[PDB]
Design an enzyme around this catalytic site. Structure first.
Site: not given
Lengths: 419, 414, 419, 414
Positions: B92-93, B157, B195, B229, B316-317
């Protein structure tokens, strides 16, 4: 001040006297153009900016004296080209057929996808540029400063042969402009009847019919009021078939033989291509002889012949991604090829399928190793470490969240929520 | 002729099969048939994908685990198939970034239209379909020398379902109709990401989304893999304290927005994983930092209550592998995860990094001059050198169906 | 003259002092708006024109002193409304859910369709208007002349509750504007959790959360630089559920009872609606109390309460298509209803589902007779003859080819081909 | 397990069935299987539609002929089903005007993108699907009091296939995938319509388009109805003289464009109809002027060579029926066509006229004032009065699936 219909006509007549329109033929009047415009003509900002920038690049504004491009099939690919220093985007119909059309299917290059496909990807590209520019602006990174990129590269787009008749071409040209294309090309073959077999190949339309497609495209641009670059492609170098002998201009190339379909065999080659290029020159900003075999000698012949009648005419050249460069040319010849073309007047040059080869090969390369085992080793070696090593070249995507606008939307959120 | 009683009995019988061991459904077979209509259009790609994925997860994978790379175009997925990959991961990212129906570039906060991921799943299955048509037209069938099974199962996703239970229900149906083999849903609420940090929904609400998804698949009659997830490893905020199950993690402190602060970490993740296990075929603890010790803790805890439960793991990339692990640890990482029961592993953003980096790499040299030298050195010659590995796209016309459509033309014309 | 970033900020500050922005609160700065704009802000011509026209209509420019609308779900429906003398288009999310969304599916009204759906139909409408205007202009039919229609009606569009969080609202607002909407409405219920059952119903969000959605929408419009009308809808007349008690402003309506989901029961009715309307008034150009039961007395209460704090505030009113008018009101009351609302300050009025009822009923009516036999008799009696009888009212579609642009494209063809 | 030999034999056997009597295929079963791939996704709506349409055309229609009204939204088609209509006509003219994927208003000259008509076919089948889900969820099944078979066969306009034989092939596949039961192709070339008149292609080229379409259907394995339209009644121009079959109609004169002038009229139409008959399931002579005498001439000529051939007929929505025919002739017109063998009849633009006129009619009164009076008089009260006719949309929430999704929500939530 309100602008009357009479004033619109006058302003158009005036615009056609400017340097932009030197040597360009229009077989219709300013009055005719305004007649088709409606009372409200919505602005096409990306197209206006792109067309003006492309014209500047073509006439001395480029870094190398010519513009060299690589076919892009996603907005993100185009974005990385901008980050890398490429000055314009080439938008390939072949790549769109293969892997980016609105039928969501994989097709060969025969005008099979729906006509909204190329405009759809042009829009994608301009939106990627827009977000990148928003990110940059939100951080007050300005032209001339370190790290600055002028993201809005002009986009030159493949309109095939306009998907039917003159009205189909007219509509497609408008769709390109509305999507934000800076330039558009049309060709003189008819993909629909491409002949299968060993004695088959591309089929040309009569010169007069190809000219009418160029007129349709210029009319569309004029109606919208955008000085879009118009590129006339000829397929006459390789095409030895012609749909009809109705144009006396084509007669000298007709051999007399007919196909079962009724097509006329012609003498394909540089002479036929020259004939077409000369015919299209008055109706296009650039002329392009499609070539499957990179050949400087033939490129010179074409340029010299066009320039003999149309001095200084801008030319385009496609650099084949399938031609075996190393096998057929020395390394020195390969390295200097685009430079040599530029000196002949080929100011817009491109590798049509570069983006799809780049994407597909590298996906394969990583996947093949990864699938066998030690997966993370291969991701690190093939992707992550090379990325780190490119930071000094201006590559920023190792910082992946900012690249796609995470910081920009955090600013939006903060502004909305206050503080 | 199949009466409703018959359809209900048939469904009840299906739920007794090995496929459905240890899966909980809080609704009845009668309930499912009630929603099916009198006509139920077949979803061939989804049926084939779900069956194949189940096989791969129970002894069929070459390595004992499935490892994947996120793909964002049909052609990327096709090249993975050419390269020997067994399944596709659909991120989905990546769709947010460069492949959504808003034609825009977005960060990963559920901003794109809900039809986006199904649209790319459809693209992938069509690339697979054409590749298969090409080989078949040349007399290459299963068992033939040179045959590739192009129809890799696709795991997609679904984020958190884009709203309420009905949004999740509809998205699941759209995934299946496009031909997904598996789908994942998560328990964070992107809409209110602070945030700050990620924000969880109550366990009961996450479960309801899993139920909605299973119901959609049951109604369509497809045994789609469902992956749960949890974002509880990092998320230290919770929208509501309404589920007593979440009580132990709540600190009492509340934010300006009204959220509940929680104790994030492996224990909260375990809590969520245990809760989702009865509803999903695989559970997944989202991790930002590859850590075998934590992976072992999560797996141990889940397996103590749910022996043999299939686990998924995101590699993780962005984590700096070389800086933080030895080359030996990097090379053995996925194998070690497999021994712990992580049988579906993936690098979410592999495809977009592959595509974007290599585009930059070529473009940067090409823009400087000597353009063809760089195309030849970076693309054409490396392609030639990969012919023995099974790369066929140097023959670019055949790859995209030129030969296939030539055959169509010739057949039409006689 | 080039416009600097500082100049953009100054110009925005100046614009906010104009009559258009009287009494409007913005909890962010001009500097913040420009920070989000990027260096290139593509023009949105239809949205600019629509917003300006809608503002004029709302303040004395309308024919009746109020604007009355009918939900349209195709461009062609909107076109016929323009031909008929309607002054603005209402764009219903319910109708889009039912029969015009990008999932190509039939849905009830619960924010189930993809978020690009309403903008897609707004675009369709503006394109129908555009072609009609092109036809008119090509024949030099001018304002004030017999047969003239000002085709570009302002479009007011349903944004539901923005499909998620503040950023989803921000993006949807931008999509509306880019499609060419003149006005957009947002509501304070959460469709996703609408409670099923006899003790279910609509669920409100806290007032502060509804206000933040309005801020997000205004920010989007400000960033694009378009003075789009913003309409705040409250569902508090009927909604007796609330997601959270976190806003002290809502406390007086909370009963103490909770649902299984954890929602708070509230006292629904005119008082709760008034509370919401008063809260939203500073952050919207119009306020709208959603009503299932047309009631002048309650309409007066709402208007009087809002006007007591916000004199002259523009109000909107939905006129129910399902309420049994004849059964509950006299014919005199029915005929005067919209007029009476106008006197109270309801200047934007609409029947949300008029277009879908119009289309669906009349398709049924013709089909039912036609299917039984004597088919052409029924087409002639129900469609063709009534069409002929409406020519004097300005109906032109009996001349079907010209209506859709056959004459316009014939002119294009002729101009291309010469003569 | 089905080998290629087996698939080829199975196909060859299918072609011996009653469905394929008198149909010519200039290609082989082997040719068809060659293009099919190893996986052939099911097209349930198209299979059901094609079967039902064939039944209706051979004894199943109530009146002995099928009469249709062009629909341009799913909801219009649904209301036709509610009203008792047996099949849907899907008009390209209407799609050009008000329902295409360019979101634009166009005249009828093949200007919209080729995915447009399939997109609306998909919309219609989804409206049908939801209506059926609604009734089924309320225990209404075939045979139940109150059951309606919502899945009407859809016959769709493919124009002239949007280019060459491969464009026709792809469009046919897209029609079938969307769920069309029948598709029509015509022998004019809209692209060069002269400002003038319509322009024909050679007979052989029109036949090739029919072959392309049949091949697409054969490859997908769906017995879709194929309708051959000729525009030769009015078209007096021809692109090329390459087909000797067309010789007799050519006058010798050629236009500036290079076209050949021809003798338009019933004889040219008959020529084309006879030529297309062996390739198509129905033939259709496009007519602008309803004329029983000419219809009889066309039918007589076709049936002399092809006894029993199914014919289609378009009933003009613009012809001034009342001015030119008696009320008696108007009322009996479709019945009289049926006696001549015109078994599929339609008013192409009925839906758009229905929609556009009634929108104008309501809007014009409403804009003048007394708005609610006009809504009540023109819409609400007439709806109430149609409840006994089977109109249900006054109950507007149930109509669009509110009750169905309420049931989904309740099942998920337990």
């Amino acid at each position: 001040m309100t602008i009357s219909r009479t004033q619109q006509i006058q302003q158009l007549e005036q615009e056609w006297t400017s340097p932009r329109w030197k040597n360009i033929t229009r077989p219709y009047s300013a009055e005719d153009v305004i007649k088709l415009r409606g009372s409200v003509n919505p602005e096409c900002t990306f197209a206006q900016n792109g067309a003006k920038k492309l014209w500047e690049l073509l006439h001395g504004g480029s870094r190398k004296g010519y513009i060299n491009c690589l076919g892009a099939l996603t907005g993100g690919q185009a974005l990385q080209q901008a980050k890398a220093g490429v000055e314009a985007i080439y938008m390939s119909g072949w790549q769109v057929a293969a892997d980016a059309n609105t039928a969501s299917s994989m097709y060969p290059d025969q005008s099979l996808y729906p006509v909204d496909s190329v405009p759809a990807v042009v829009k994608r590209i301009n939106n990627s540029f827009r977000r990148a520019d928003q990110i940059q602006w939100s951080n007050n990174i300005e032209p001339g400063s370190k790290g600055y990129t002028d993201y809005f590269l002009p986009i030159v787009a493949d309109a095939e042969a306009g998907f039917g008749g003159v009205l189909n071409a007219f509509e497609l040209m408008k769709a390109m402009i509305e999507a934000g294309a800076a330039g558009v090309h049309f060709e003189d073959q008819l993909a629909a009847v491409k002949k299968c077999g060993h004695m088959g190949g591309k089929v040309l339309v009569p010169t007069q019919e190809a000219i009418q497609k160029l007129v349709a495209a210029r009319l569309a641009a004029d109606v919208l009021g955008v000085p879009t670059l118009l590129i006339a492609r000829t397929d006459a170098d390789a095409a030895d078939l012609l749909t009809s002998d109705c144009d006396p201009y084509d007669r000298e190339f007709i051999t007399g033989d007919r196909t079962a379909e009724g097509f006329f065999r012609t003498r394909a080659g540089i002479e036929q291509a020259i004939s077409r290029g000369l015919a299209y020159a008055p109706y296009a900003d650039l002329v392009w002889c499609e070539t499957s075999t990179p050949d400087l000698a033939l490129a010179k012949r074409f340029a010299d012949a066009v320039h003999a009648q149309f001095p200084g005419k801008l030319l385009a050249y496609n650099c084949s991604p399938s031609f075996n460069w190393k096998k057929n040319l020395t390394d020195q010849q390969i390295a200097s090829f685009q430079d040599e073309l530029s000196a002949m007047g080929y100011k817009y040059q491109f590798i049509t399928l570069a983006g799809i080869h780049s994407m597909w090969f590298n996906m394969f390369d990583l996947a093949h190793a990864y699938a066998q085992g030690e997966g993370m080793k291969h991701y690190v070696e093939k992707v992550q470490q090379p990325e780190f090593a490119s930071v000094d070249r201006g590559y920023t995507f190792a910082s992946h969240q900012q690249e796609v606008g995470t910081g920009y939307f955090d600013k939006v959120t903060n502004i909305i929520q206050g503080g």
